[PDB]
């Protein structure tokens, strides 16, 4: 609308601009050219001079006729004083007057949520660097579990920092590149959450298929999932009515390339979460456990709570929902879901005392 | 000077890349140990899974120094047949070992017949999951289940909780289906999962 | 006979009691602590040696401290360069679970053995492009525990047969065997001049033998149980001992009496290996509480503490001149303390 | 041990037949050896930056 | 997904705000 | 030098009682556990009793449980084993035994042949 009307105005303003010399200068005003009902270019309306009397027709803008019911010519008061400019009324400029609806509150609502997740990511981008500062080079305690968590922590860092760039650019090759790259960075996180979920389940279903070769396959399946859909999303962008930097994501007919791979990734991670929990439940069914023997709630509650932030299952809280009528869904995934990187960082780098015994060696070596 | 450095680095990378040629092959071989040349070894693959079971009975009877070297084996195989009391006493020391904490032990049985050395099981309760299909008379039911609970009583009274035992009944398939559970507990406990 | 023979055996022991008590005319505690200490000496992790699939169990320094060999438990035998951490050879083995490895002082052969009861020697002259087997020294009834090369013709082996034996490379047989131990012998140490050697079985009975005559010369006792590692003085007139008693002791070869006892109250872990320094004042010993500890033999004080590993140290060793110390633990890493 | 019981006499007599010098002389020679040879060893002495090529 | 709708809907309100300024400012 | 000296025994009528003693020497009794091993004529070595270093967790075998008691004294490093109702199957040579690794709860094969941490032992008959 904005870019459409701006381009239509630039293509139409240079057209009747020559009539400015043909109005109030040409077509001599010997026909009672009142000072109000005069012809001139006002950059808003382009109307010619007329004689005083009853209503006189005007030149409605073709880009604004659809905004009102009278999709054609319009008339204004042309009395002894005449209409000075557009005859201000409900049909002020041959179109809607205010056209404001639901934007007086949702605009401030989105602004309050905007500052919410940015300050949340502001502390998340530094928390991950503290969490990544352990598994980066400390080979005193390193194994295959870090070989998967490393990529996941990198994906959270890339996604959190990239969100801090969207406001400075959107709020040209700039928006053209930063848009497709933003979708790729988003899908990189959901895909790696699926790979992490697929990795731990495959390690339990078939406990012998871990011979250091599926890692290269999982890395390819991880970084290669967004590199395919977003690429297909980017090429189809130009081939199907490329307009602006593609802020038209409301087109659900074509947006399946993005929302599609996401909802299935959460769905597969959901069904895998049931299988992994079922296998863990089978381990509790043995009377050889030390701490708990009857009250399964004492262990399963403190076990699924650790797996929820790592699996990112909380995204399913409002999946398969009427997104077109559930604008409040952002509160679950943007206001609270922004800290997902912070929870997975504090749970796998501050808890899990195995990573605490490693840094304790440096703590004792400092005083040694 | 670069003549000797490049040649030495060439043999270095030629050997480092050799360790990669059998590293995954080594980890794919889940070693095993069987308790009652100086050592007997058998090899067999079950469903694309390698198993190198060793027999150390040919060594010295004293097991104070050579059993410490077996901290790397993933599963120990124990068998039984007053030797019955000494077999349980040996199981206690293996359980309460300082270093043998990550090697879950498997317990087997054998055909036998013993009642006069342990007069306490005369009042032992009936088995809760008895298997009377082979026609077990109440003698062998209470006897087998008493020695069964005796080994289990040892594995619950002491220990830190990082290894368990797995009795069985009357082969190789029964070991592979149980060794899988040991690997499952290994890859699951690493992720802080209770 | 045993009614009188065991009585004469006990009566002879009292003769040993009054013998060792008669030499107790002075104490070494006053002589050792009436001098100046040296304090802490800085030791840093200069190099780490990765590249092992399993945990190591023993090492042996090379000829001129330029190289060192380590034996992994999976079956690999690796030779390393101390200067640039480069692998020289990666000779495989016929079986796994080794427990000892010896490096010849001439650098021509390398020996290794374990539960196989077979001591194998390997020529170091690369004819076929790699290392090949040369001779297998089978015949024992128990596992081998320690081996030491005297020359390129002679080699002694400590094995679970409760009897040490001297072997000749020419034919590979027990030319001379020693007897008089109670329990499987676990470690032996060779004198620097190759003129004497001592061993210790699982009875804390450190008994001295002759390299040229198959007979016992001296006997040492005083550890509670399970002596584990022995090392001679740099000159050869004394030797320290490491046992599961969580305390080290120093014995001499002249007065035949326990000289000093290195014990502490804040240790509940047994000793696994022990090695001397070039000067002899420092005693290095690997503990079972995941850390290393060096003892001042002339002060009986914990001069310094070395840490970095999270598993038990199973081997030690120093250069041929006291330049650097090699410490290997079950972490599969070989950290060169220097 | 009845047949090999002779070891309890011929072997334990070794400590009684060998000479045993007093410990006051066997102690001074040892500590003097450590003090005299405490100069050629890189250990026991702060290693200067010019030495220790193993860095 | 979530972030996609938020970026799209907020940009639409940003466009509507500019159109309102264009309305009150030019017509 | 460590030495294990036992005392008590001799021929007694069946069903009697006795108090076997074990005298520890040469090592610290406060850091080690103790065990008792008997040997029937023409049979091997069988562990029959034990005790912890903390003076608790006393255990026995089913064949001597109840009619056999073991006691220790850290003040004198002594060990006392008293029993009653001497059976004909109990006629065997008993040996005082100790296992290495003090301050630990694990030691293997104390009844193994050619073991030095065992005294000369005494015998009892019916």
Numbering used by the authors:
A (entry chain R): 30 to 200, 212 to 408
B (entry chain A): 12 to 47, 205 to 249, 264 to 295, 308 to 364, 371 to 394
C (entry chain B): 3 to 340
D (entry chain G): 8 to 62
E (entry chain P): 1 to 27
F (entry chain N): 1 to 126
The study reports:
The class B secretin GPCR (SecR) is renowned for its physiological role as a regulator of pancreatic and biliary ductular epithelial secretion. In this study, we have combined single-particle cryo-electron microscopy, molecular dynamics (MD), and biochemical cross-linking to determine the structure and dynamics of secretin bound to the human SecR:Gs protein complex. While there are parallels to other active class B peptide hormone receptor structures, the SecR demonstrates a unique organization of the receptor extracellular domain (ECD) to the 7-transmembrane (TM) domain core, forming more extended interactions than other class B GPCRs. Secretin formed numerous polar interactions between the N-terminal half of the peptide and receptor extracellular loops (ECLs) and TM helices, with the importance of these interactions supported by mutagenesis data.
Complexes of the receptor with dominant negative GαS:Gβ1γ29,10 were formed by the addition of 1 μM secretin. The complexes were imaged by single-particle cryo-EM. The first data set yielded a map of FSC 0.143, 4.3 Å global resolution, and this was used to build the initial model used for MD simulations. A second data set was collected using improved vitrification and imaging protocols established subsequently in the Danev laboratory. Only the high-resolution structure is described below; however, the original model derived from the lower resolution map exhibited high overall concordance with the model constructed into the high-resolution map. We also performed extensive MD simulations (3 × ~1 μs) to derive further insight into binding dynamics of the secretin peptide to the receptor and engagement of the receptor with the Gs protein. To better understand these interactions, we interrogated their stability in a simulated POPC lipid environment over microseconds of MD. Importantly, the cryo-EM conformational variance data were consistent with the MD simulations where, overall, the receptor TM domain core and the secretin peptide exhibited limited dynamic motion of the peptide backbone, whereas the ECD exhibited higher mobility that was independent of motions of the rest of the receptor and peptide.
